[PDB]
Every structure is written in structure tokens, then in C-alpha cells.
Design an enzyme around this catalytic site. Structure first.
Site, PDB file in Angstrom:
ATOM      1  N   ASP A  56       0.855  -1.220   0.000  1.00  0.00           N
ATOM      2  CA  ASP A  56       0.000   0.000   0.000  1.00  0.00           C
ATOM      3  C   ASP A  56       0.873   1.245   0.000  1.00  0.00           C
ATOM      4  O   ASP A  56       0.598   2.204  -0.745  1.00  0.00           O
ATOM      5  CB  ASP A  56      -0.906  -0.067   1.191  1.00  0.00           C
ATOM      6  N   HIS A  57       1.969   1.217   0.781  1.00  0.00           N
ATOM      7  CA  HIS A  57       2.867   2.349   0.880  1.00  0.00           C
ATOM      8  C   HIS A  57       3.772   2.560  -0.338  1.00  0.00           C
ATOM      9  O   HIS A  57       4.461   3.577  -0.377  1.00  0.00           O
ATOM     10  CB  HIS A  57       3.692   2.233   2.170  1.00  0.00           C
ATOM     11  N   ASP A  58       3.784   1.606  -1.274  1.00  0.00           N
ATOM     12  CA  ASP A  58       4.382   1.809  -2.584  1.00  0.00           C
ATOM     13  C   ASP A  58       3.395   2.475  -3.553  1.00  0.00           C
ATOM     14  O   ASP A  58       3.823   3.106  -4.504  1.00  0.00           O
ATOM     15  CB  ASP A  58       4.776   0.451  -3.175  1.00  0.00           C
TER      16      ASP A  58
HETATM   17  C1  HEM Z   1       0.220  -2.601  10.708  1.00  0.00           C
HETATM   18  C2  HEM Z   1      -0.686  -1.646  11.014  1.00  0.00           C
HETATM   19  C3  HEM Z   1      -1.597  -0.692  10.231  1.00  0.00           C
HETATM   20  C4  HEM Z   1      -1.837   0.599  10.712  1.00  0.00           C
HETATM   21  C5  HEM Z   1      -1.377   1.247  12.030  1.00  0.00           C
HETATM   22  C6  HEM Z   1      -2.647   1.307   9.687  1.00  0.00           C
HETATM   23  C7  HEM Z   1      -3.133   2.633   9.852  1.00  0.00           C
HETATM   24  C8  HEM Z   1      -3.752   3.386   8.848  1.00  0.00           C
HETATM   25  C9  HEM Z   1      -4.164   4.779   8.996  1.00  0.00           C
HETATM   26  C10 HEM Z   1      -4.019   5.641  10.214  1.00  0.00           C
HETATM   27  C11 HEM Z   1      -4.686   5.136   7.793  1.00  0.00           C
HETATM   28  C12 HEM Z   1      -5.301   6.469   7.475  1.00  0.00           C
HETATM   29  C13 HEM Z   1      -6.714   6.484   8.127  1.00  0.00           C
HETATM   30  C14 HEM Z   1      -7.586   7.681   7.731  1.00  0.00           C
HETATM   31  O1  HEM Z   1      -8.321   7.635   6.720  1.00  0.00           O
HETATM   32  O2  HEM Z   1      -7.586   8.746   8.415  1.00  0.00           O
HETATM   33  C15 HEM Z   1      -4.572   3.990   6.951  1.00  0.00           C
HETATM   34  C16 HEM Z   1      -4.891   4.010   5.628  1.00  0.00           C
HETATM   35  C17 HEM Z   1      -4.556   2.966   4.728  1.00  0.00           C
HETATM   36  N1  HEM Z   1      -4.477   1.585   5.073  1.00  0.00           N
HETATM   37 FE1  HEM Z   1      -3.965   1.036   6.919  1.00  0.00          FE
HETATM   38  N2  HEM Z   1      -3.102   0.354   8.739  1.00  0.00           N
HETATM   39  C18 HEM Z   1      -2.273  -0.655   8.861  1.00  0.00           C
HETATM   40  C19 HEM Z   1      -2.314  -1.797   8.077  1.00  0.00           C
HETATM   41  C20 HEM Z   1      -2.726  -1.859   6.753  1.00  0.00           C
HETATM   42  C21 HEM Z   1      -2.742  -2.988   5.937  1.00  0.00           C
HETATM   43  C22 HEM Z   1      -2.347  -4.391   6.429  1.00  0.00           C
HETATM   44  C23 HEM Z   1      -3.149  -2.597   4.652  1.00  0.00           C
HETATM   45  C24 HEM Z   1      -3.365  -3.391   3.414  1.00  0.00           C
HETATM   46  C25 HEM Z   1      -3.212  -4.685   3.178  1.00  0.00           C
HETATM   47  C26 HEM Z   1      -3.435  -1.161   4.740  1.00  0.00           C
HETATM   48  C27 HEM Z   1      -3.863  -0.296   3.732  1.00  0.00           C
HETATM   49  C28 HEM Z   1      -4.115   1.078   3.909  1.00  0.00           C
HETATM   50  C29 HEM Z   1      -4.340   1.988   2.710  1.00  0.00           C
HETATM   51  C30 HEM Z   1      -4.263   1.611   1.219  1.00  0.00           C
HETATM   52  C31 HEM Z   1      -4.637   3.216   3.260  1.00  0.00           C
HETATM   53  C32 HEM Z   1      -4.896   4.527   2.539  1.00  0.00           C
HETATM   54  C33 HEM Z   1      -3.506   5.130   2.230  1.00  0.00           C
HETATM   55  C34 HEM Z   1      -3.560   6.507   1.541  1.00  0.00           C
HETATM   56  O3  HEM Z   1      -3.293   7.546   2.204  1.00  0.00           O
HETATM   57  O4  HEM Z   1      -3.859   6.560   0.293  1.00  0.00           O
HETATM   58  N3  HEM Z   1      -3.340  -0.848   6.156  1.00  0.00           N
HETATM   59  N4  HEM Z   1      -4.217   2.858   7.732  1.00  0.00           N
HETATM   60 CA   LIG Z   2       5.211   3.429  -6.294  1.00  0.00          CA
END
Ligand code: HEM
Ligand SMILES: [Ca+2]
Ligand SMILES: *[C@@H]1O[C@H](CO[C@@H]2O[C@@H](C)[C@@H](O)[C@@H](O)[C@@H]2O)[C@@H](O[C@@H]2O[C@H](CO)[C@@H](O[C@@H]3O[C@H](CO)[C@@H](O)[C@H](O[C@H]4O[C@H](CO)[C@@H](O)[C@H](O)[C@@H]4O)[C@@H]3O)[C@H](O)[C@H]2NC(C)=O)[C@H](O)[C@H]1NC(C)=O
Ligand SMILES: *[C@@H]1O[C@H](CO)[C@@H](O)[C@H](O)[C@H]1NC(C)=O
Ligand SMILES: *[C@@H]1O[C@H](CO)[C@@H](O)[C@H](O)[C@H]1NC(C)=O
Ligand SMILES: [Cl-]
Ligand SMILES: [Cl-]
Ligand SMILES: [Cl-]
Lengths: 464, 105
Positions: free
Chosen positions: B94-96
């Protein structure tokens, strides 16, 4: 100030508190929420859209950065070795840690005053959010430096830029391989994998590779996989005493745990040898993220599922039936129909009590409620959204590792041998690792093998 | 855009030679469906007290979380066929792909 006030004024969109909330008794309080930046601030013409700060491509931008000044700053410019910068204060039993960042209001410092360990600097700004994520970032940093070192021995006349770029290309390809060969088939299951990710043919310059707004919400399905602890295991894959299971609400931004509580090896072992949480319809997401998200560093604990739903509203995403329709799936209109779609009338009734119609169910909520595909970990709606996005990222990437001209045929053959277990062997003190597929293997010792059984990446075809 | 190149740019610019921002950083998301805002163009559902969505009141996000998502942590079911590395690769991936910026405090 959206962090300290409960006033609804731009750019704030605080989550209001219902009556009889199990945690927040004051109904004049709120969960803080900043609206995502608009692509066109202040417009009376545009339909508001949000911005992606990163490259959409599966290109390891989380390691290298998505903007040129950051990318330069992540590099070691002291020499011609093409390396990424490493921590100048600490090592993890002789192996590299990420450099420290210099933030004005550093949340990692808040998690432990006496430790004074700041947040790490990586290609993405979230690298210190949990030590398990930090560990993966650190593993990729090491792998880059390992490859640049090996490439310098192979090609002593290559300069720093060439070494950096060739190692960056390899790291990007490894991320693509792991993702499409190992990870996605286990998210989607075999039928959806065949439907949405048929065998690659070649680059198509008419495929739009952008991330869709909906995917930023849909790919949050992973929140349902999160366990309530960070698990640390020693070299016998036993609990590493005295705190082998730390509650997640004491690990967010806890970079000190990586530096002062044993490095990345115990964390990576914990990830390999502990099961994920299973998503079930009455076990959707844990309270460590629903009640205590970032509790140490903020005025109140956040609710991540709630944030996901408020975020989909912030982004103007259509509701559940519209996405079902987009995907070519039947759209339930009554509680009885929703019950059939969910194989669960109890959950259908609870949803209807909140939302009134399945037209209005927020995409994350509806998506994670559906029964899982066979040998997958999402339902049909999320499978369509996720599978569609990743096909575009593949077919629409001119630098996809299999596209002709990116690597030689011999380099492609060598790359096909990589695996995440081998990357772990090469860059850590761990000597026993998961059997392929790492994402399925989860029980020590049944699913574990020694590092000497795994083929290492042969760089011979990079010699010039 | 250079007419030949060997490596990716850092920003993703020039991957698509015909539309060279596609997939590049600091650009708007693509929409697969048209947005749905309370006023059509900017305000999110739930912004204005009493404004319904498609005929029905908007549920508080925290109410939905309380009523549908909340469960007793002791009931957690470990997945016999996935490791926690399956979760963690997802987050890293996701972070990529995406980060959606917000204004500072
Ligand atoms: C290992 C722990 C994980 C977190 C701690 C975490 C936290 C977040 C937060 C705070 C957001 C933003 C929330 C908001 O809308 O205010 C967030 C967004 C995203 N998630 Fe999270 N998460 C953790 C773990 C995962 C896993 C396992 C993911 C996917 C398999 C995953 C995805 C994402 C995505 C795509 C977003 C949106 C990112 C963006 O800014 O475009 N998360 N999560
Ligand atoms: Ca990328
Ligand atoms: C390169 O990729 C593009 C884009 O493909 C889309 O993304 C890919 C990742 C993959 O998922 C593809 O399946 C997906 O389409 C391809 O270009 C698309 O090609 C399709 C098929 O020709 C076009 O769809 C047509 O769209 C017309 C309206 O805009 C529509 O009128 C057509 O429907 C009529 O014709 C059909 C067939 O007779 C009939 O069944 C219908 O009922 C209707 O009368 C049809 O839907 C897309 O618009 C194209 N998209 C773009 C961006 O150009 C391209 O083919 C592919 N090339 C290669 C070599 O792979
Ligand atoms: C740059 O690389 C050299 C050689 O590995 C090393 O001694 C130095 O610590 C590195 N500098 C940074 C900032 O990483
Ligand atoms: C803070 O860090 C030190 C190590 O620097 C550790 O001994 C101490 O227990 C930590 N504090 C907490 C609250 O965990
Ligand atoms: Cl440093
Ligand atoms: Cl080991
Ligand atoms: Cl969208």
C-alpha cells in the site's frame, strides 16, 4: 485546529460520537479528522478529488522516494558506491538501520522519553508507524546496499549513479515478483486471479496506471488481518522474553523498540511464525485499532474502521450497490436480498438498521462484510476492485520486469528465482525461514526450512 | 520526455510517453465512478445535520463501527493458512502505491 478542536469547519470533518458509546462518554467530544487535500482548492467548478503523493507503479518508491529532493537525501553521497544512507548512531548487530528523520513534532520521541529515538527516514513518510513495517523497510534498505556492493565487485568501473540505478531496478522487480507471484493469488483466490490477472502479455500504453480513488479505501481490507499484538520470537522461534507479545497500542511510532529491544530479527520471526487474523463476519477488526489507534501520541484513541468510513465520505465514494454494479455483481435492495449476498441475515439486518438501504453502505464496510472467495481473503466486490487495480499497474507499467527491454532474458531467468524468505536470509541474522509460500506458511517448525536450501539471486548476467 | 531512457524517473513522470503524468506522484486519483457529495461537488455525506443520503439518514461512522465491527478480542480466529507476514506485505505494498495527503494542523 483539527487535532484539538471539535468544530466542523474546513479542513476539519470530525467524527461525531453516538450515544452509549463504549469508550467516549462525552458526546461533545469527537475523533479528529482532517479532510484529504483537494486537487483544486477553493473551486466552484470542479467536483472535489484527492491527490496521490506517491508513484502508482509497483516500483519500490517506499524505499527510494517519489520526489527528487527526498530521493537524493536518502542516498549516501559520500562516495561512488551507489548506496542508500544508513543510521550513523545505531546498528542492529552489525547490520544497517534506517537513518533518522528530522521532524518538528516527532511522534516517535513521545512513545518513550528516556529512549530519545526519533522516527526513521524512508521513501515513504509512514515507515515508523509500526515496528513490523519498519522491519520490512529496513530489510529492503539492506537489500539495496547488498546488491550495490555485489554489483561493484562484479563491475568495478561502474560509477555511483549506475550502481544505485541498477540495484534500484532489481529491488523494484523483487517487489513486483513477490507481489504478483506470491501475495495477490492469496488475496484474490485462484478464480479471481484468473479473471483479473490473466497471464501477462506485454506493455499496453493505453492502460491507465493511476490509482483509483476507490482503491485507497478498498485496499484497507487488510485492517481485518491485524492481530492485537506485535509478536517477537528468538532463534528457537520461541517467545522472546520478557515481553514477547506487546499490545499494538504500545508499538505505534515506537522506533525505540527496533533500536533498543533487539533489532528486526525477532520481529521478522514473529511475522513468519504467527498466523494472521482471519476476517469473519462477527470478528471484523480488533479493538487495538478500533479503540486505541495511536493512543500514545494523540489526545484520544482513533477508530481505524470508523476512519475508513469517514474517509470514503470525505472522498465522495459511491456506496456498496454502485460498486457492485460497477463490478457486474447483483445489487441487493432488501434485507432478504442482502442476507443472501452475505449468507448472513443477522449481519444484513444490522447493516440495514444502520444504513437503511444497501445503496448507502460505505464501500469498506460492505466490502469486508462479504464472504471470502475460495482460497482468498476478500469477497467478490473487493476482489474486483483490487484485481482490476493491480492489472492496470502491471499492464500499464513500461518498466514492468517482464516487459521486453527492461531486463535481458538471462536477468529475467535469474530474477524468477528470488523469494522473500531468501531476502530475509541474505540481510538478517535469521537462519531458518518459512517455506514458500511465505504468506501461507505460519507454523514453526512444520512450515520452516534452513536458508541453505534456498537458491540465492545469481548476478552473473549483470556483468559487463 | 527523453525519447530513450533506461531507468524509471523518481516521480514516475515519462512512464507513459503519450500521457506522461499517468502514475506520477502528486497528481489526482482517477475516478472509476463519479463522486457523491451532499452538495454534488464538495461536502461529504454526514457534513450537514439532517441531510439524507438517497432517502435515508447518514449513520455515524463511529456508530457503524460500534454496532458492526466491534467484537470481543478473545474470539479472534487465527488464520490456519496465512501468516502475519501476509498482513505486513499488504501494508508495505500500500505504501508503494498510495498516500493521500492532508493539511497540517
Ligand atoms: C500494521 C498496522 C496498520 C496501521 C497502524 C494502519 C493505519 C492506517 C491509517 C491511520 C490510515 C489512514 C486512516 C484515515 O483515513 O484517516 C490507513 C490508511 C490505509 N491503510 Fe492502513 N493500517 C495498517 C495496516 C494496513 C494494511 C495491512 C493494509 C493493506 C493490506 C493497509 C492499507 C491502507 C491503505 C491503502 C490506506 C490509505 C492510504 C492513503 O493515504 O492513500 N493498512 N491505515
Ligand atoms: Ca510506487
Ligand atoms: C490495451 O488496453 C486497452 C485498455 O483495456 C482495458 O484495460 C485492460 C487492463 C484490460 O482490462 C482490458 O480488458 C480493458 O478493456 C484496450 O483498449 C480497450 O479496448 C476495449 C475493447 O475494444 C474498448 O472497449 C470498447 O469501448 C467502446 C466505447 O468506448 C464500446 O463501444 C465497445 O463496445 C461495443 O463493441 C463491443 C464489441 O463489438 C460490443 O460488445 C458492445 O456491446 C458495444 O456495442 C467496447 O466496449 C475500450 O474503450 C478500450 N480502452 C481504451 C483505453 O482504448 C486495448 O484493446 C488493449 N490492447 C491490447 C493489444 O491489449
Ligand atoms: C556511506 O557509505 C560509507 C561506506 O559504506 C559508510 O562508511 C558511511 O556511513 C555511509 N554514510 C551514510 C550517511 O550512510
Ligand atoms: C523506555 O526505554 C527504555 C530503554 O531505553 C526501557 O528500559 C523502558 O522500559 C522504556 N519505557 C517504557 C514505558 O516501555
Ligand atoms: Cl542517522
Ligand atoms: Cl533463526
Ligand atoms: Cl473511484
Amino acid at each position: 485546529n483539527c487535532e484539538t478542536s471539535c468544530v466542523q469547519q474546513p479542513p476539519c470533518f470530525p467524527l461525531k460520537i453516538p450515544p452509549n458509546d463504549p469508550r467516549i462518554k462525552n458526546q461533545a467530544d469527537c475523533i479528529p479528522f482532517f479532510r484529504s487535500c483537494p486537487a483544486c482548492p477553493g473551486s466552484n467548478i470542479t467536483i472535489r478529488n484527492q491527490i496521490n503523493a506517491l508513484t502508482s507503479f509497483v516500483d519500490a518508491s517506499m524505499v527510494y522516494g517519489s520526489e527528487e529532493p527526498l530521493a537524493r537525501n536518502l542516498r549516501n553521497m559520500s562516495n561512488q558506491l551507489g548506496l542508500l544512507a544508513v543510521n550513523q548512531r545505531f546498528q542492529d548487530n552489525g547490520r544497517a538501520l534506517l537513518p533518522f528523520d528530522n521532524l518538528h513534532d516527532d511522534p516517535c520521541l513521545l512513545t518513550n522519553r528516556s529512549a530519545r529515538i526519533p522516527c526513521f527516514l524512508a521513501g515513504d513518510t509512514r515507515s515508523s508507524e509500526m515496528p513490523e513495517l519498519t522491519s520490512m523497510h529496513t530489510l529492503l534498505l539492506r537489500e539495496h546496499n547488498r546488491l550495490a556492493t555485489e554489483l561493484k565487485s562484479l563491475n568495478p568501473r561502474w560509477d555511483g549513479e549506475r550502481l544505485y540505478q541498477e540495484a534500484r531496478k532489481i529491488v523494484g522487480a523483487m517487489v513486483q515478483i513477490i507481489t504478483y507471484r506470491d501475495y495477490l493469488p492469496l488475496v484474490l483466490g485462484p478464480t479471481a486471479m484468473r479473471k483479473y490477472l490473466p497471464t501477462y502479455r506485454s506493455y499496453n500504453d493505453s492502460v491507465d496506471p493511476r490509482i483509483a480513488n476507490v482503491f485507497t479505501n478498498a485496499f484497507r481490507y487488510g485492517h481485518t488481518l491485524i492481530q492485537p499484538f506485535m509478536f517477537r520470537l528468538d532463534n528457537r522461534y520461541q517467545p522472546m522474553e520478557p515481553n514477547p507479545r506487546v499490545p499494538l497500542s504500545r508499538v505505534f511510532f515506537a522506533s525505540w523498540r527496533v533500536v533498543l529491544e533487539g533489532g528486526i530479527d525477532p520481529i521478522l520471526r514473529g511475522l513468519m511464525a504467527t498466523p494472521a487474523k482471519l476476517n469473519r463476519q462477527n470478528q471484523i477488526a480488533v479493538d487495538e485499532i478500533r479503540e486505541r489507534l495511536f493512543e500514545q501520541v494523540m489526545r484520544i484513541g482513533l477508530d481505524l474502521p470508523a476512519l475508513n468510513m469517514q474517509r470514503s465520505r470525505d472522498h465522495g465514494l459511491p456506496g456498496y450497490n454502485a460498486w457492485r454494479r460497477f463490478c457486474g455483481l447483483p445489487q441487493p435492495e432488501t434485507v432478504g436480498q442482502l442476507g443472501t449476498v452475505l449468507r448472513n441475515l443477522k449481519l444484513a439486518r444490522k447493516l440495514m438498521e444502520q444504513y437503511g438501504t444497501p445503496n448507502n453502505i460505505d464501500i469498506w464496510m460492505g466490502g469486508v462484510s462479504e464472504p471470502l472467495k475460495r482460497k482468498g481473503r476478500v469477497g467478490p466486490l473487493l476482489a474486483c476492485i483490487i484485481g482490476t487495480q493491480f492489472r492496470k499497474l502491471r499492464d500499464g507499467d513500461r518498466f514492468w520486469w517482464e516487459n521486453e527491454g527492461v531486463f535481458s532474458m538471462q536477468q529475467r531467468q535469474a530474477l524468477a528465482q528470488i523469494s522473500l524468505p531468501r531476502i530475509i536470509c541474505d540481510n538478517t541474522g535469521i537462519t531458518t525461514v518459512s517455506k514458500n509460500n511465505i504468506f501461507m506458511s505460519n507454523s514453526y517448525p512444520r512450515d520452516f526450512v534452513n536458508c541453505s536450501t534456498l537458491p540465492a539471486l545469481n548476478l552473473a548476467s549483470w556483468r559487463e | 520526455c527523453p525519447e530513450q531512457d533506461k531507468y524509471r524517473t523518481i516521480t514516475g513522470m515519462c512512464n507513459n510517453r503519450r500521457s506522461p503524468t499517468l502514475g506520477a506522484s502528486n497528481r489526482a486519483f482517477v475516478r472509476w465512478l463519479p463522486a457523491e457529495y451532499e452538495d454534488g461537488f464538495s461536502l461529504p455525506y454526514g457534513w450537514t445535520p439532517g441531510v439524507k443520503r438517497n432517502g435515508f439518514p447518514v449513520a455515524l461512522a463511529r456508530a457503524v463501527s460500534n454496532e458492526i465491527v466491534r467484537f470481543p478480542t478473545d474470539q479472534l480466529t487465527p488464520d490456519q493458512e496465512r501468516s502475519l507476514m501476509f498482513m505486513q506485505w499488504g501494508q508495505l505494498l500500500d505504501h508503494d502505491l498510495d498516500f493521500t495527503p492532508e493539511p497540517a494542523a
